[PDB]
Paper text:
Ribonucleotide reductases (RNRs) catalyze the conversion of ribonucleotides to deoxyribonucleotides, a conserved reaction that is fundamental to DNA-based life. Nearly all aerobic organisms use class I RNRs, which consist of two subunits: α, which contains the catalytic site, and β, which houses a subclass-dependent metal center. Contrary to all other class Ib RNRs studied to-date, the sole RNR of Bacillus subtilis displays class Ia-like activity regulation. We find that B. subtilis RNR has arrived at a remarkably similar solution to the ATP-cone through the evolution of two unique allosteric sites that modulate catalytic activity by inducing contrasting quaternary interactions that either enable or prevent the full range of motions needed for RNR activity.
A 6 Å resolution cryo-EM map was obtained of holo-NrdE under inhibiting conditions (100 µM dATP, 1 mM CDP), revealing an unusual double-helix with a hollow center. In this structure, each helical strand is composed of alternating I-dimer and S-dimer interfaces, leading to a non-terminating chain of NrdE subunits. Importantly, the simulated scattering from this double-helical model captures the distinct secondary scattering peak observed in the experimental scattering (black dashed), indicating that this structure is a stable species in solution. For both filaments, excess density at the S-site was modeled as dATP. As dATP acts as a specificity effector for CDP reduction, its presence at this site explains the formation of the S-dimer interface between adjacent I-dimer units. Additionally, a distinct, protruding density is observed at the I-site that is best explained as a dATP that displaced dAMP. In the NrdE-only filament, this cleft is unoccupied and partially buried by the double-helical interface formed by residues 660–665. Consistent with this, our cryo-EM maps of the dATP-induced filament display empty pockets at the M-site (purple stars).
Residue numbers in the entry:
A (entry chain I), B (entry chain J): 4 to 162, 167 to 238, 246 to 687
Amino acid sequence: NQVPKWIQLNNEIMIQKDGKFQFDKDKEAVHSYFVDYINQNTVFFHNLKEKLDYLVENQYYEEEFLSLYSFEDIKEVFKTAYAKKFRFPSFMSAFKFYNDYALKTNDKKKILERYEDRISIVALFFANGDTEKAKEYVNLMINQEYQPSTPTFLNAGRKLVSCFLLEVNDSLNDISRAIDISMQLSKLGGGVSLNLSKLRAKGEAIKDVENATKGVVGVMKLLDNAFRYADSGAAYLNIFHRDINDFLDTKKISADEDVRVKTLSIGVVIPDKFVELAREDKAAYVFYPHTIYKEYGQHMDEMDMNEMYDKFVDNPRVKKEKINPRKLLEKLAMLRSESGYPYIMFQDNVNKVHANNHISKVKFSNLCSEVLQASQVSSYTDYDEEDEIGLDISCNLGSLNILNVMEHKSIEKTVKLATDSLTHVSETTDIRNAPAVRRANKAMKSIGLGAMNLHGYLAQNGIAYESPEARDFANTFFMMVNFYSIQRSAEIAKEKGETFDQYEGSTYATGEYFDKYVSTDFSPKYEKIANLFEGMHIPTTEDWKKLKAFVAEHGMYHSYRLCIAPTGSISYVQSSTASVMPIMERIEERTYGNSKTYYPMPGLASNNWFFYKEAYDMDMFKVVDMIATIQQHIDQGISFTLFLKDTMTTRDLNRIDLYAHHRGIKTIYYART
Amino acid sequence: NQVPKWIQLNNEIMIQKDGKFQFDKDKEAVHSYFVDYINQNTVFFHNLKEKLDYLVENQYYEEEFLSLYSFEDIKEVFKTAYAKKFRFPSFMSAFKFYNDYALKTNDKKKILERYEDRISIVALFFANGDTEKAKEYVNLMINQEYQPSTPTFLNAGRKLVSCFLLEVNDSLNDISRAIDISMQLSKLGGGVSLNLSKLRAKGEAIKDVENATKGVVGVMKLLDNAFRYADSGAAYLNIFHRDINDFLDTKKISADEDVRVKTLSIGVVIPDKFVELAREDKAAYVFYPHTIYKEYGQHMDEMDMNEMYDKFVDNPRVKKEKINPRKLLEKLAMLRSESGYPYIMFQDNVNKVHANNHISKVKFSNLCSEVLQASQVSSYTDYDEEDEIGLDISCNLGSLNILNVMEHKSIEKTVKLATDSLTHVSETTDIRNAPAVRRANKAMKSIGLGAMNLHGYLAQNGIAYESPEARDFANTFFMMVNFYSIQRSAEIAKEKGETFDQYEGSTYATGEYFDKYVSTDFSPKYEKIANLFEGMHIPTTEDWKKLKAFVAEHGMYHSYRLCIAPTGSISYVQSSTASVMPIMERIEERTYGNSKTYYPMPGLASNNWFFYKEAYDMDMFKVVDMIATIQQHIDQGISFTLFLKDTMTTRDLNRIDLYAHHRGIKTIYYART
Ligand SMILES: Nc1ncnc2c1ncn2[C@H]1C[C@H](O)[C@@H](COP(=O)(O)OP(=O)(O)OP(=O)(O)O)O1
Ligand SMILES: Nc1ncnc2c1ncn2[C@H]1C[C@H](O)[C@@H](COP(=O)(O)OP(=O)(O)OP(=O)(O)O)O1
Ligand SMILES: Nc1ncnc2c1ncn2[C@H]1C[C@H](O)[C@@H](COP(=O)(O)OP(=O)(O)OP(=O)(O)O)O1
Ligand SMILES: Nc1ncnc2c1ncn2[C@H]1C[C@H](O)[C@@H](COP(=O)(O)OP(=O)(O)OP(=O)(O)O)O1
């Protein structure tokens, strides 16, 4: 029943040594725990050969790509990994890896993989034939310069994507098909979310008899019950609906029998017409999209509301409903101050930067609230009858370290290896239930790249998070990685000799995304910011001009390359801080079980004490200015989590919303307290 | 606000005239209501031609089969119907027909069809080309000798079956497919019920990881939520399951959050192994059907429990669960005394008479608890992958009058016309969502025929319902209609030159159903019973021998011909009593709205006062003896509703269950109080 030594060492960290903390007690809490637990619970082997034979015979890996190398090359990459002798600085480093991310035994009572082993296997999977590229993947990974996504780093050749975005058409067979597809993907752990802007409203005529539609809320109840059969999902709605108030009745603070959501996150996508109508404080008009489909031929989200609003107003066919949009703004701010629900997307601001607007307009995002692509709704008829194959969205993940890239300065080769690995993931992944997402991943070849450790690295350098220096740092750095990513995508579309589909209507084929970058040089205007960027060439606008000429020469390979997700589940094993969102506490405190670990921030001392600020005590306006500074280079959206408190008010949240709509911010996340 | 005259006349019926009731006040309550309401709210026409033109142009009928006759032939059958000048004797006769069963206007504020019109249109639909057969259908219908089923008589050529029985396989794609099919048929108003004997138990391994099955109760919760999207359904389970106690937790008298059923009726199908194990008062063993499928290869209901019970006992592979079956009998009787739930089916007793036992064994029935056929479960893979087409059950309805057939004595031609009409219904009906029931209706060509007015007719003749005279009457009469139905089916399979599928393995191809009837002449042993049957030839065993030779000569057309449903919704417009279940009250009293109609039984006077007994004051044992006497001629089951009271006990209900299992009773219905 006795607490072991390393847990007591972690308890000893919080002992006030002259007003500070016993940080080095972590290390023994590392070092004893390696000795007393890790090295005493590992399965013994006599060599590498019998170890690999045990891995083969005990049915733990796909043996094919493992047999794409010799045993000597496998031992070479293993010796290369073990030549690091990686010394974990954090208790949570080993305390999450060998606890969760490491592949253990079948009874899960001993250790199988080491920290080098999983990384080397993932490197062999990413390289898939080459030994030296796998060693480069190791050097990108064993120095923690890159970290792949959670199922990607988890089940590389074992027994894959957490981003899925679909639509729904207005037929019962479509409803059953979508229910089936969500149940198919729910057992695979992928993040599946949708949007319901193409369904008929409550109390409408179902094709023969008047006043027959039970409403969308029954379908939401059905999907909420359907998600109770697996381990989660989400759905959206365009704002100009009569049941949009009922869309606010979903996440009601009085949890009803008739409305009881537990899994489906909601998010209201607001075009500029609604903030236009609420800004003038004039009464607005939502409509019936089935009457719109019966009158004009298309759904309401098929057309822009700013054009066709008065065209719906004067036309007597589509039935009206008149409300106050300012009262809806008040109730939205009220629900956001209650919880932080729902999400808000400025889809016109998304299309204001969207390169593939020639295909469609983005009208929704994921649960991770980051991916913004084009889409097409399908249509499913009966079983004997033939159906349709629309367009879908699937964007893989995987982050890098700002700190390790900025210290090791292999940034272009980092872009090379990360792009090749994400290309390999997009190639290998296949879906055999809904062929629409299969066709979408086959057609778009879309990837998503992000990064972490912004506040911890820059605050570790002695730079405030609320500095314009850090904003210019993000500006120049993401200009450089934008240069390298577009350079790599154009090189890859050259080397393949082939680009993604509908590349010609995008801004890359016309060079319009580079039109911002052929002028307006984002060279660092601050001295410490430039000195951090010293040691490497900063690409100017002429480099962007040659990049534009090379893109117009061949083409670009990925319709999207970048997304930013809250990838906080891997910061501990990356021995690093979170993503570009600033930290909340200098010391995380957890009760693991029968214990209290006290994990401080990595690099926490008294010099960066006030550089490691608190998220409850920051100006959010400088944060969204930084968000816009980063969004100057990101194609898709960024999951900006709002860091708020309980004492704030709804009208200041409204001012934040007007400020973000003024900044052209794409999406927002659930708020803090 | 004043109560109209005919309602006051109906109130005047209950006035005690020398200890009796003012029956003839019904007639003025008929006759004034015809004058003051019916003839004042009908749409005027100048002739028949403009009336039919209005029916065509106002989109009320399928015009094709109406154009399969001349206007003169239509006027001939209309003149034939109007030559009856049918005088309604009951207030509820017109009060349900022109209120509900008649096709009214689009705003439903006037009358379109007359009582002759709907009947004549239905007759033209049944004949479909012939005028004289339609007039014969009129004479069968306008004299109330036959009444078709509710959607059949309702929507004959307008804008169809209430019996659907399916199965479920053990895959998620199968689950989604069945959910889709139930949602497809729910909008069409058909009675859809299933059985869940081929699903894995709660807390079992889902194919890779141990203890992962949430259980069948979540699927039941899902189907209960899914039926909230339309206007009802049911599901069963074989008794030898570990979750069979949880099957009793469904209709729990404490309505839970976690278990809240509102639509799904349950019914436990009990083979002779369970009453064997509960009879000896020995501890029984339910099993895990997924372990059974993994061990022997088949589900548990694939094999007989009486054989394979000890083979499951000695085999250590299938995991056991040991209970007391007598305690389950006690809790079953407790729930039946609480409500009347669930249903009880002796499937071995069903197979003891089942002619198509060469196909499979009957393991379930419908919500109407009457139809017992063979079945095969399907299997549905993914969307791109190929699926299976199993067997299903769909049995049409439609009843006749014992009184009118016994008075008009056209019993063989009644069988002819009813069989041809039910054949036409089975031919015209098609399903375009689940092709399995389409294939099943195409393959079986199965019909269902029943009758009504047993207690009212025989009690109107001066015969007690609890007489063995009435039992011999039902014996001889249903022997005669069995003779005529088998004769008609054999004649029809001769005239088509073609029988139903798998006819050769049935008892009809081997003559074994006639082996009971080539001996044991069911001639009437009572004098008044025979005198009611006098005036027509009673078929002896030699007629059954020639029938057997004619069946072996060609074949029989329908795998099933007979079923008995509680068709009480049409007795009022048939001016008749209920089905073979005896009446409960001599005078039905209803509060229609702002009123109190008092509809007595048809033919209620002081002579048949004690012949019109009360169902709370009868011996149920004579009733189930009558049930077995009728079941001596019926192929399928009969929905015997239990007529019980509150003062009775559970052990007497157990004695009733043992008595019915002793009688070979197929199924039972929900009980009374
Ligand atoms: N931070 C850590 N990261 C990885 N392994 C560790 C860490 N801390 C302790 N250990 C491991 C390595 C050894 O197997 C054991 C402790 O021995 P350790 O002294 O840390 O390594 P070492 O063998 O390279 O140095 P030395 O020769 O001085 O013993 O547990
Ligand atoms: N009985 C019902 N109860 C509730 N919703 C229904 C019912 N029947 C159909 N629906 C729902 C589901 C469908 O998405 C929507 C439209 O009805 P449905 O007949 O299936 O579409 P449709 O493709 O035939 O054309 P339309 O859009 O004109 O109705 O209404
Ligand atoms: N029981 C009923 N069945 C059908 N129609 C009825 C009934 N009772 C009254 N009516 C109808 C028929 C007439 O249109 C009107 C009442 O006239 P009614 O006397 O019953 O018929 P009738 O016209 O054949 O006889 P009469 O020539 O003596 O008036 O309402
Ligand atoms: N994640 C899940 N949660 C709950 N039930 C599931 C889940 N995944 C599958 N199932 C259910 C539905 C299926 O009817 C049943 C069997 O699982 P499933 O993998 O779909 O069948 P299977 O055809 O692949 O073979 P098997 O019967 O061996 O499992 O368990």
